[PDB]
Paper text:
Activated Treg express the membrane protein GARP (LRRC32) in complex with the latent form of the immunosuppressive cytokine TGF-β (L-TGF-β). The resulting latent form of TGF-β (L-TGF-β) is composed of latency-associated peptide (LAP) and mature TGF-β (mTGF-β), which remain noncovalently associated. L-TGF-β is covalently linked to GARP via two disulfide bonds formed between LAP and GARP. Conversion of L-TGF-β to active TGF-β and release from the L-TGF-β/GARP complex on the surface of Treg is dependent on αvβ8 integrins.
Therefore, we analyzed the Fab-GARP/L-TGF-β complex structures of three Fab molecules, which differentially recognized the GARP, L-TGF-β, and the GARP/L-TGF-β complex in the BLI experiment, using single-particle cryo-EM. For this purpose, we generated Fab fragments from the recombinant Abs 28G11, LHG-10, and 12G2B4 and purified complexes of the Fabs with recombinant GARP/L-TGF-β via size-exclusion chromatography. The reconstitution of the LHG-10 complex, in contrast, led to a map with 2.7 Å resolution, which allowed us to derive an atomic structure of the complex. LHG-10 recognizes the GARP/L-TGF-β complex by binding to the interface of GARP and L-TGF-β, similarly to and in close proximity to the binding epitope of MHG-8 (11). The epitope consists of several residues on LAP (residues 269–273, 58, 100, 104), mTGF-β (residues 336–338, 345), and GARP (residues 137, 140–143, 161–163, 165, 167). The cryo-EM structure reveals that LHG-10 bridges both proteins and stabilizes the GARP/L-TGF-β complex by binding to the interface of GARP and L-TGF-β.
Author numbering:
A (entry chain K): 21 to 140, 151 to 168, 180 to 198, 214 to 229
B (entry chain L): 15 to 153, 163 to 179, 188 to 208, 223 to 227
C (entry chain C): 32 to 88, 99 to 114, 133 to 207, 254 to 265
D (entry chain D): 280 to 390
E (entry chain I): 33 to 280, 290 to 299, 312 to 424, 438 to 439, 442 to 523
F (entry chain A): 30 to 50, 79 to 84, 102 to 112
G (entry chain B): 279 to 329, 353 to 390
Write the structure that this text describes.
């Protein structure tokens, strides 16, 4: 059991930027690591072999570095295809242990929600807002980021406050 | 090229046993290891042990000691898993990996995985069947779907939201600014 | 087709391959050490079993099988049969063998299994050629066993 | 060594290779009236000789069953099972039917 | 200190601290712990081989800073890689490590080996290495010999020896290799590929610089063609014996098909399926000295080219099925020995062996050849030639020193048959001839030393 | 020094074809006749 | 289809089963096989011309042995050991 930690729980960046994820091992690891690139719906995909040995057919923007106790993954230019969860793995002891996962998403600018209401199980809906910090008071359900404009949505089954609009508008029917 | 195929596991009532299949093709089955990794939506990725189809040697992690047993069948090039005495803290996607070199090269050490399966969802809910009851909503506009357990609904400037669990039942939604298999 | 091949190298290579084959078929990483070998000849049971199997009458066929026998208590003690074979998964062959006393006239016999409480299930049948001396007759009874001096039951199974 | 795996891949080991013959397209003969063809297939792939030791790792002992099962001196990749093929060919003016032997191969061993 | 073969269970702690060379081979040590061993920091030759050592302490050898040679050979270190991660630690001064006989494994070997810049010779032979990947031999920039013989190696990637720019001796004997598709080890000097299953050998095409290989060993392989060696100018010794070559590239059992020999010296085409020699084949083997062709089913051997095989000192050709042979004048001028026995020669030109300028030894046994018998020939053997009459002028002007005529029933010796052999002959044997009377004046032979007239 | 890959298929098959170079419905090295008797 | 009853003590240039003896004490240098002292292994050799072809065994026989593991004796039976006849492929 070699417990490993991924320092950032989740991070948001933009196109053509430098992303970094670190990995800290409970004990010494030497150079027996691996990084994975799971998609939001599919199985994990190997990215880095050893500790810095890039695989074949995967983009070279990712780079490996470190040894023994500290390892970092760096992405040269962030792209829409590099959005997902990233994992650690060690093969230096009989129990193979993975990391915890770090979600990488995009951001472009702030967007204002358009709060809607629907009387009947009443539903209050928000649409086309960027920041995933919508706070609504009377089972919320956010969606996944859209591939077109990287925007969020929410459904509550209402008082809405957000960073996009300064005034905490309250609408009722 | 080599590819391993697993079929979706739908649903299994609590207290029963599940069977996860990992039919493989494109390579000599009785020459490699097979790893079983479990992705519960609660925490990370967990590694159960591995099997050697050629011999049958079984090894497993410290937590799955006797709670899981996986066998192989070399005639049809498939590897299996047997999970017993299901609980609520078991619903997860069970993947299927290959160490990428050979059993001979990877003697007793451990490596990474280059060929993954597609996973199976072993879901325990103790809910049999009940058709969705779509509810109309209007002043944009959309649809309301309630209690459409246990397997999804497809409904066709659109927005669908992930189903939620409440009172042992699913809850769908739609909004615009039903073909249920079960 | 012309004579250009010598038997010296063929003998040597066959010899070395035989060494490797015995080592592989027994799954011995290294030859066993003789530290615990008791002094004296082999026991009577083991020698009798070896002389019994020496009598002349799938990917997993390559490896060896431990050979055991059970004498009749034709009924048998199921306890001894289970003592021979831990669980029926590893069993690979089980031949029932017989020793007819004297048959000067040709006759045909058929095997059977105690299936139900009173019923018996038919098995393969064979004809006996005349002979003035005792001889060993066999009948492969592998299926019934997995389902489950004097004539005996020879067994062959994967070691535990 | 599955037949499907051998016939739908490329390995440098003794495997049965897929082949279908058409009497007209492949053989270029027309005197055989029936049938249109058959899957004769063939065996191809080297079987290396394994020099042995007294002390070997537990997991190299599996190479013997795959490469030199019979402990031969110079192993060869040969068919292990064969099937018959009936045809209909004209010899002169009288049509003839024969059940030819050792024509269709299914699996190949190292012997 | 020499404590070899004493049956000691543990490491002794009574050794003087000034020990420079310690011997413990053949004991019952099952672990090398750091505390007993760290006392003798002055060790330069540690010998622990032929033990049952299964576990290695991570800080075990880190104290012996002046180690120059350690030998853990023939140990149970295969399970150490699983029992212990890291295995060997860095060995800053070790020059010769010998881990042979350990049943080590590829992959396990990739982790067991620690970096050693001062290592001069590593041995892993008699192990269970099945394949050599790109990251097996890494971080040994001073290795110049690597022993891998009697392994089960089958696959070798393109750049397995990439991290060894100074490997010169490579022994790959008794391995399971089948097809060699490339060869680009520029500075390699010795390559041994004997007792393998190699059906085809191809080298790299158009290298930047000439390769340094001077020793190829393809004996007892399954080759079907004479290998293309146009890119190996300095290959000197070449065994191709005990193969299937038919002179007089493809691997039919696999299905793969993808001054050449100026300085080759020792060619060995014995035990092949050769039936004929094309003329151009012998033109390339200039300056070749010793040529052996025995146990081939060749049926005709001729050399008409002027100056062909100019310095051929020996010509072994016995046990063929020859009917005829032709030797050109002033062609095999430097030919000193000629093996010709075991054949079926019937008729030859009178001067077939006369033109050999410096022939000394000539075996012609079991051939049925009847006597013209050379001022230089020394040893002769016409045994089992079914001879009946020996004419007087057999050896008038051939100062032979050794002469054998055994096993020739019905021999009729003419008067004066041994014409000029009185002063040159030294040993003569006529065993089994069944002669009734001797027509040769023995006392006139002053230089005779031993005689054999048995049977 | 590298081992061998990409065993050819097209050339091999052509060689093999060269080497291969109610009575029907009811269906030694040398071929045997087929006849029916009822 | 050439068994030992034909090719043994016969002058044949074509492929048939040849004689060979295994003795565990001298050839293999083993002392851990208590019984037997050896067995007749044989081997197939000889050219098989066209009517590349190989000559391979067709009939094979088992070989039971007795040996020691630890202190408990055991009896085990190997397979495909003795070459009995050869065929042309
Ligand atoms: C490449 O490695 C092979 C395998 O070791 C070398 O051949 C071996 O050479 C040794 C001599 O150093 C031979 O050992 C001798 O064995 C006889 C018994 O036959 C023994 O009486 C002698 O005292 C000596 O120990 C060994 O038999 C021989 N093995 C084979 C298979 O021929 C070979 O010389 C190496 N090549 C190069 C270029 O280094
Ligand atoms: C190339 O390698 C081959 C090995 O394949 C070497 O052949 C070996 O040659 C020696 C002497 O010519 C043979 O020894 C002989 O044994 C017989 C008994 O059978 C004995 O009566 C002779 O007096 C002689 O000592 C040896 O058997 C043979 N090895 C094999 C496997 O046939 C050859 O010497 C190598 N080439 C060069 C140039 O060294
Ligand atoms: C084909 O002919 C060659 C000769 O051209 C044979 O090679 C010869 O083999 C013998 C036997 O090993 C060698 O004699 C040995 O010499 C070494 C070193 O001087 C000595 O230590 C040994 O005690 C023994 O006397 C001989 O040198 C060698 N000749 C050459 C040129 O290498 C070869 O064996 C023949 N082929 C076969 C299959 O026999």
């Amino acid at each position: 059991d070699i417990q490993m930690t991924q320092s950032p729980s989740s991070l948001s960046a933009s196109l053509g930027d430098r992303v970094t994820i670190t990995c800290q091992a409970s004990q010494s690891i030497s150079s027996y690591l691996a990084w994975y690139q799971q998609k939001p719906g599919q199985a994990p995909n190997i990215l880095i072999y050893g500790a810095s040995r890039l695989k074949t057919g995967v983009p070279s923007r990712f780079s490996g570095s470190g040894s023994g106790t500290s390892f970092t993954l760096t992405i040269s230019g962030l792209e829409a295809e590099d959005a997902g969860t990233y994992y650690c793995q060690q093969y230096a002891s009989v129990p193979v242990t993975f990391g915890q996962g770090t979600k990488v998403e995009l951001k472009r600018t702030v967007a204002a929600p358009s709060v809607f209401i629907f009387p009947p199980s009443v539903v209050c809906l928000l649409n086309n807002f960027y920041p995933r910090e919508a706070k609504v008071q009377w089972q919320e359900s956010v969606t996944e980021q859209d591939s077109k404009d990287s925007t969020y949505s929410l459904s509550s089954t209402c008082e809405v406050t957000h960073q996009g609009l300064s005034s905490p508008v309250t609408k009722s029917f | 090229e080599v590819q391993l195929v697993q079929p979706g596991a739908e649903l299994r009532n609590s207290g029963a046993s599940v069977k996860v299949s990992c039919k493989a093709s494109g390579y000599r089955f009785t020459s490699y290891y097979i790893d079983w990794v479990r992705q519960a939506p609660g925490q990370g990725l967990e590694w159960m042990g591995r099997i050697d189809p050629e011999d049958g040697g079984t090894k497993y992690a410290q937590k799955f000691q006797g709670r899981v047993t996986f066998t192989a069948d070399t005639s049809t090039s498939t590897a299996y898993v047997e999970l017993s005495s299901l609980r609520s803290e078991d619903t997860a996607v069970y993947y299927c990996a290959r160490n990428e070199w050979e059993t001979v090269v990877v003697g007793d050490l451990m490596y990474e995985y280059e060929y993954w399966g597609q996973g199976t969802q072993v879901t325990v809910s103790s809910a049999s069947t009940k058709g969705p009851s779509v509810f109309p909503l209007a002043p944009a506009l959309g649809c309301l779907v309630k209690d459409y357990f246990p397997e999804p609904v497809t409904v066709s400037g659109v927005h669908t939201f992930p189903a939620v669990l409440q009172s042992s039942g699913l809850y769908s939604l739609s909004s615009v600014v039903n073909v249920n298999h079960k | 087709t012309c004579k250009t091949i010598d038997m010296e190298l063929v003998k040597r290579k066959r010899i070395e391959a035989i060494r490797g084959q015995i080592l592989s078929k027994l799954r011995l990483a290294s030859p066993p050490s003789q530290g615990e070998v008791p002094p004296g000849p082999l026991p009577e049971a083991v020698l009798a079993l070896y002389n019994s199997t020496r009598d002349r009458v799938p990917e997993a066929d390559y490896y060896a099988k431990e050979v055991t026998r059970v004498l009749m208590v034709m009924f048998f003690n199921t306890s001894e049969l289970r003592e021979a074979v831990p669980e029926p998964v590893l069993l690979s062959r089980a031949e029932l063998r017989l020793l007819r006393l004297k048959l000067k006239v040709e006759q045909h016999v058929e095997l059977y299994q105690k299936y139900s409480n009173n019923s018996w299930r038919y098995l393969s049948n064979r004809l006996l050629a005349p002979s003035d001396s005792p001889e060993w007759l066999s009948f492969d009874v592998t299926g019934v066993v997995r389902q489950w001096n004097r004539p005996f039951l020879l067994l062959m199974a994967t070691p535990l | 060594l599955d037949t499907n795996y051998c016939f739908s891949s490329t390995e440098k080991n003794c495997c049965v290779r897929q082949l279908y013959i058409d009497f007209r397209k492949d053989l270029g003969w027309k005197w055989i009236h029936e049938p249109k063809g058959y899957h004769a297939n063939f065996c191809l792939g080297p079987c290396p000789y394994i020099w042995s030791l007294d002390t070997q790792y537990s997991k190299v002992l599996a190479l013997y069953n795959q490469h030199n099962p019979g402990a031969s001196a110079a192993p060869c990749c040969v068919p292990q099972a064969l099937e018959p093929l009936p045809i209909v060919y004209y010899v002169g003016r009288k049509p003839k039917v024969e059940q030819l032997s050792n024509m269709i191969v299914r699996s190949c061993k190292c012997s | 200190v020499s404590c070899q073969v004493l049956g000691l269970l543990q490491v002794p702690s009574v050794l003087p601290p000034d020990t420079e060379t310690l011997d413990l081979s053949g004991n019952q040590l099952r672990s090398i712990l750091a505390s007993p061993l760290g006392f003798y920091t002055a060790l330069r030759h540690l010998d622990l081989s032929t033990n049952e050592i299964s576990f290695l302490q991570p800080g075990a050898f880190q104290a012996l800073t002046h180690l120059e040679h350690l030998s853990l050979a023939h140990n149970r270190l295969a399970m150490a890689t699983a029992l212990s991660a890291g295995g060997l630690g860095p060995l800053p001064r070790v020059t010769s490590l010998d881990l042979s006989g350990n049943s080590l494994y590829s992959g396990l070997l990739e982790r067991l080996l620690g970096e050693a810049p001062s290592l001069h010779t590593l041995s892993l032979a008699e192990n269970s290495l099945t394949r050599l990947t790109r990251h097996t031999f890494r971080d040994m920039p001073a290795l110049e010999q690597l022993d891998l013989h009697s392994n089960v190696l089958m696959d070798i990637e393109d750049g397995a020896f990439e991290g060894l720019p100074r490997l010169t001796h490579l022994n790959l004997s008794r391995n399971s290799l089948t097809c060699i598709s490339d060869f680009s080890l520029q500075q390699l000097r010795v390559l041994d590929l004997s007792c393998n299953s190699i059906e085809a050998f191809q080298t790299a095409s158009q290298p930047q610089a000439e390769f340094q290989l001077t020793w190829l060993d393809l004996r007892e392989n399954k080759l079907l063609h004479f290998p293309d060696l146009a890119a190996l100018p300095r290959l000197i010794y070449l065994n191709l014996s005990n193969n299937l070559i038919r002179l007089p590239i493809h691997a039919p059992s696999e299905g793969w098909s993808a001054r050449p020999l100026s300085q080759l010296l020792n060619l060995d085409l014995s035990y092949n399926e050769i039936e004929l020699i094309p003329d151009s084949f012998l033109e390339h083997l200039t300056s070749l000295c010793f040529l052996n062709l025995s146990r081939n089913c060749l049926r005709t051997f001729e050399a008409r080219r002027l100056g062909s095989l100019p310095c051929l000192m020996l010509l072994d050709l016995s046990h063929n099925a020859l009917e005829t042979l032709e030797l050109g004048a002033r062609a095999l001028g430097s030919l000193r020995t000629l093996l010709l026995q075991g054949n079926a020669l019937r008729d030859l030109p009178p001067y077939t062996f006369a033109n050999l300028a410096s022939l000394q030894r000539l075996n012609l046994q079991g051939n049925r050849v009847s006597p013209a018998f050379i001022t230089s020939l020394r040893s002769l053997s016409l045994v089992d030639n079914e001879i009946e009459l020996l004419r007087a002028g057999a050896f008038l002007h051939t100062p032979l020193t050794e002469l054998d005529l055994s096993s020739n029933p019905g021999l009729e010796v003419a008067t004066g048959a041994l014409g000029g052999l009185e002063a040159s002959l030294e040993v003569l044997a006529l065993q089994g001839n069944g002669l009734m009377v001797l027509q040769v004046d023995l006392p006139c032979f002053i230089c005779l030393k031993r005689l054999n007239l048995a049977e």
